[PDB]
Scaffold this active site. Sequence first.
Site, PDB file in Angstrom:
ATOM      1  N   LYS B  63       0.802  -1.224   0.000  1.00 33.12           N
ATOM      2  CA  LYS B  63       0.000   0.000   0.000  1.00 33.12           C
ATOM      3  C   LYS B  63       0.839   1.281   0.000  1.00 33.12           C
ATOM      4  CE  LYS B  63      -4.198  -1.943   2.164  1.00 33.12           C
ATOM      5  NZ  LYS B  63      -3.872  -3.400   1.919  1.00 33.12           N
ATOM      6  N   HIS B 285       4.436  -1.074   8.172  1.00 37.30           N
ATOM      7  CA  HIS B 285       3.188  -1.761   7.817  1.00 37.30           C
ATOM      8  C   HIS B 285       3.428  -3.264   7.801  1.00 37.30           C
ATOM      9  CE1 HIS B 285      -0.920  -0.851   5.994  1.00 37.30           C
ATOM     10  NE2 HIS B 285      -0.848  -2.159   5.841  1.00 37.30           N
TER      11      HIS B 285
END
Lengths: 518, 518
Positions: B63, B285
């Site tokens: 992402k 992340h």
Amino acid sequence: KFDTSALEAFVRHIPQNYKGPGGVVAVVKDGEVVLQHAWGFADLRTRTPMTLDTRMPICSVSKQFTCAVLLDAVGEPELLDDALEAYLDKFEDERPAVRDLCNNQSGLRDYWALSVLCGADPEGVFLPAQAQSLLRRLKTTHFEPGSHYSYCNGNFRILADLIEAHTGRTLVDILSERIFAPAGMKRAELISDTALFDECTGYEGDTVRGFLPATNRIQWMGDAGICASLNDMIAWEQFIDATRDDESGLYRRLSGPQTFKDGVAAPYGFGLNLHETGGKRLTGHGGALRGWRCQRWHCADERLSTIAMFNFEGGASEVAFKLMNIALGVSSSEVSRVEADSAWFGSWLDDETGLVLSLEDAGHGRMKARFGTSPEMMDVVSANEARSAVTTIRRDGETIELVRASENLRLSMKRVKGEAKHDIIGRYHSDELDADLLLVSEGGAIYGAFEGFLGKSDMYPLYSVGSDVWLLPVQRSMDAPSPGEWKLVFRRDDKGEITGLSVGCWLARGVEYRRVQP
Amino acid sequence: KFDTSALEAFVRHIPQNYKGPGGVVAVVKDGEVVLQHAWGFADLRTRTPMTLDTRMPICSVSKQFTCAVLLDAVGEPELLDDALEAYLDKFEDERPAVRDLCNNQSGLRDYWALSVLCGADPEGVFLPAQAQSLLRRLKTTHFEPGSHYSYCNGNFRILADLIEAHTGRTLVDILSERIFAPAGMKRAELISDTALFDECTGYEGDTVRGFLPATNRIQWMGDAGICASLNDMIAWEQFIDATRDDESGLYRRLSGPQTFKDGVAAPYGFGLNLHETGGKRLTGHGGALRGWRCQRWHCADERLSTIAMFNFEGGASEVAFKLMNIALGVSSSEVSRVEADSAWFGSWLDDETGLVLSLEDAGHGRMKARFGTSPEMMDVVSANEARSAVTTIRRDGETIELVRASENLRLSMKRVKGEAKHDIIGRYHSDELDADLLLVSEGGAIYGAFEGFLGKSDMYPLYSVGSDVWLLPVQRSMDAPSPGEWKLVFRRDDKGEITGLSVGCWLARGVEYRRVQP
């Protein structure tokens, strides 16, 4: 009218307490069906409901039927002792009697656990020629016959072969003609090839991991193989009740008391577990395979039977037991527990047997013990004493005494300590199995593989618990429960060189391997 | 010389504490690799060792790369707001801004959780045309954009489509040319079709259940899709450190502070989690898919990054976090707990959202809570207060106040009670998804299936927790973590007739269904 109100209330909550696709349960009292229920699905994808006539593999509940065939069509086990001598033709130790095979006091190591050491794939095909090749190469026992109890499927797989050869008939045909027809078990059948069975699907997994359809391709008979529905199993319980007063009747002949060679009471006889609850004697048996669980229990004094069969790996045995206790009005009750001292935790080794006990905190005055084929929960009842329903342990400093009185087993185990050296890598060979264990390092982490006549296994991680003592978990195998954790105990020279090791688990102890590589 | 002694001691024990086939870890300090290690196997059956150049799917770690592409090749998110209006052409509520998509404050319900409600098979093929069909039919949000945080993969899958259309280039090509080449990520690649990836095998399961090779066939991009090795991921950490002082540099532009619309600090920005440990700010992340887990973290003040990637479902995020704390010398410390009163246990319902909290004893002053996508362990710190790292709960009689301050979420939940009626069986329809939920009884046990444009699911058992409130666990799905438990809250007339129900989970709340059958 036998009041089933408390049984019905329990059954209504089974799907929420024993989570899984479907199942069936029954309670038989005085020869009458007083409770019979099916719930859920036989297959979640085709959406085929579970029914009272859905057949499922009853797995190890087949053992009692093979001893019933033995008594009905052959006679006492002593008539096959000569044939056992020719079947185990390479035996180097005293062979067990055929009677010891029937009572699980034989000393033979379980062949399904040994199939893992011979390189079997957990979902592999296993033929009758491979069963005989593995059983007939056995040479030694892991205890003297009659001295202890250990569950051994090979005892019953050998029995099937002995029966067919003595009679000149197939076990399929004898069961049908001599047992299923007279008992009114209309659709029960020996279906030895598990790959052919598709009337119900079994599921591996649980409510947290998810459920996955199981694939099984082993062929078996004598230790398992019968497939039957709930209605078939009800007919067996009714046959038992109808023949209860015949001293020479088949079930009465299978279900009397047994002892070890020293006269101590034993817990198994002719394919049946022998147990008690609230002072009432029970006989019965459970069965498991990947995807499947079932159990039957019978209380002769109250003419009561309970049955539970699931197409998933949940507690069918616990369900059948609880129905029996509820129907008998047995109050199962509470133990006062104490805090578990931190000195209990870790692993403990028995030098005689090579077995290991591992203990960890399970909370509130409870410990999770790993010793037998499956882990067991122990209540800590005093500073130095803990127990499960089967095992008692007492700690004294750096030693634990472990007793399983029902097996006639008592071990003295010492705390395992130290850092394990990684010079155990190399190749090891078992002369009796003609099989190798290969141990390698990948980035400092040790892995092992089993290589023998059935194939070469996948690599499995090993975990050290102290100097020269390692655990090798095997979670899935051809039979169920899987062996659990293999205990590897390495042996060294006076120079500190490894010469070999003992590989074992409760089902198959002390398999000796010699170093041949690295 | 940055002292890695404590990091090395931790890494040496990873295989025993985080059990599974293999993995890789690295620590980068001041732009230099100070720790880099591979262990175990990429495939346990072919016996292919894990290496530092073995590529694996990094899943949701992709992402941040899609927001980096956005800033580099398009500009600020506001340039795509017109295109978002045309993409979500049936939207009935206020559409989120593209900036809200980047920060996970959009209010859109997660499309991978919605794919379960549309009948997707967990191991099914999922094409780009099906992604667009599901995303472009969305009409409503589950909270006002900018008011709360919720993790939504659809935000990033839509972003990928917007970027390709605005630029007239493929995300595959833009990532390669604008991000991977300049960062020195030599073998990183967007491989959108997960069925084509075979350089490493991922495993579902754990040390108790056993490990099984995972099959994944979904196609994705923007929310995931990049495959890269440990050495590729190290090059990204080094690029970050080399560009640390450029205020207009890509990573600095992705990783600044964010707020909700009311000015409260938010925990996510441009594809990165924003967190802190011992007073030191972190950005990073994690990623998951059936069979795979990974995590990266970076601490800008200390120029330190940590990476962990596993080909199994173990705690890679916990490993990467612990390496970071060890390298920062952060002492993570102990909470004094109190006994959990029995009044906490059971389920609690929020009327506004339709979400449910369930609590159970987890032993020693701890409770297992089921509320979010995964269960969380809570410490009981006082008679009426318990907390996890993310959620705090306070009990007052028959109400619980639940707060997740990082999400800007506060719920008031009432104890759920009563016996659930089984008149909920029948067929229900969601107009927005064009999907049905079928509920049936099989022997008194209720099961449900999801039927929509992706297919018809298998039947799944449902469990009641009080009147008209039921749980439907879904343990395996196309994306990972799976939704967890869907919460079904039925609604009735003044006559007591069911008119419909709310179906929801944290990833996708309040999906309304109307009764159409039984």
